[model samples]
Target chain A: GEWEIIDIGPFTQNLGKFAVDEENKIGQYGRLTFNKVIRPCMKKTIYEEIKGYEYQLYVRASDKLFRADISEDYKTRGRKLLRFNGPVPPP
Target chain B: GEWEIIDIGPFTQNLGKFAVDEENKIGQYGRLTFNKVIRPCMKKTIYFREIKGYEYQLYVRASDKLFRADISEDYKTRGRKLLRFNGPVPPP
Candidate 1:
């Protein structure tokens, strides 16, 4: 718990503000986190199937890019090599 | 023609080492090699979702490609292609 809370990608942890368009409805968008949802939807073996894979997701905006982890044990199970339809998140 | 020569990855120029079969079969791998970039938007990713429905082969190295509102939701299963060669993965 000692790790400092750092803003990730385009998001700030404190003193920052963003607004969600209350009425804006989104159905489809692009990122790296997709496809895998299909894994469960397709009934991948809960114990055996997903064992050795690296899981991740991606986000994009006009000038910024972001990555989010989707692995069961993300920190240990995640990989830095991610790809999708967005700018590279600030290094 | 000259960008910063950042030292990294598994390859290099005049100062590196490598080996081969002297002959190797190859695929149409390009950088998209010479293909190039469209924007600062070079497809950086995270916080993504699928197009729809059940599908397979989510991401590809060349061109393709979180969780937890379910904080309390116990256990999620991953997928595997083994045992089902050329077979359509079943639907959960």
Candidate 2:
């Protein structure tokens, strides 16, 4: 377990922190909360069509102008490649 | 112009190499090729729906066991996360 954490684009470990506004009611404006609810995953499969096929997503930083092409595996629904000139995750 | 290439997982720049077999006319088996034809942009839109939105691709190496937690931006169809416990690309 001694590999390095190589971050190409903006990768946010967690979303922005949230605080409860308990003055009157924090109801009008919905706030995203990092709750402490632990639940078990009932279903193991992610997408229905790509049932047996598991996908790994990665990100590469892009300028406003960028282009990419899918890999040969795009047809058989396997080893897919999405190359994009994209953005970094927000801080 | 200048940036470092960071590879977390087994990222293959190009797919496997190919060769034309000529014994009986290598036809039945389809081989993927890195073509050298340059084309101009016609209708320049990556995805029809995710227009105005962009995405980045990255790879994280996983051993026999791996786990991950996606960030908050998954809802907007913008910032999504994918963690894969997978294998390596075969040599060309």
Candidate 3:
């Protein structure tokens, strides 16, 4: 509900946008996740894929896929990241 | 030097179970090499980090860590994900 920053509260993945890392193979670069699947989806976006390990997020800008190599716990981390990023999960 | 699967074909870190993740530090639920690395060794537990990303594999257990990559247009990715080995610091 509120923008609170607590360790146990919630967190997201961190894709450090390295100079040329944006055009990454995972696709989304750092726009989607952070620090890995330690957390995930509390919301939605035009670009969201919460199911499956290898997720291919479509980046309209470059018309490329911002893939999420979600290995294990996605719903958890994916949800957490959404909270961390503070974006209402799109429908 | 037997079954293919290496090189150009494709490739992928580790995670601490009892890690102390804080707002100041990043957290990892990877479970070292649990499902995070997924897929089997096929050969050996390798024990030695395998390839990740379309990237390359670095760190020979150095930093006591493993990292790899895969950006695009090329075969080499740059990420430490899809971990290969996972020694729980072991017990002596």
Q: Which candidate is the best by DockQ?
A: 1
Candidate 2 is graded, for docking, as: incorrect
Best by lDDT: 3
Candidate 1 — which residues are off by over 4 angstroms? Answer: A1-46, A49-55, A60-63, A74-91, B1-58, B61-92
**Lowest lDDT 10-residue stretch of candidate 3 chain B:** B15-24
**On residues B1-92, what C-alpha lDDT tens digit does candidate 1 reach at each position?**
11111222332211111101100112222212111111111111122452211111111112220000000111134221111111111110
lDDT of 1 by residue, A1-91 (tens): 0111122332321111111111012212322222111111111112453443332333333334433322233235532322222232222
Could you tell which candidate, 2 or 3, scores higher by TM-score? 3
On the 0 to 100 scale, the lDDT of residue A13 in model 2 is 15
Real contacts retained, model 1: 0.00
How much is A58 displaced in model 3, in angstroms? 9.7
Q: Show where candidate 2 strays beyond 4 Å.
A: A1-44, A47-50, A54-77, A82-85, B1-92
Model 3 ranges off by over 4 Å:
A1-78, A82-91, B1-60, B69-92
lDDT of 2 at B12: 23
Q: How accurate locally, in lDDT, is each candidate? A: 0.20, 0.21, 0.23
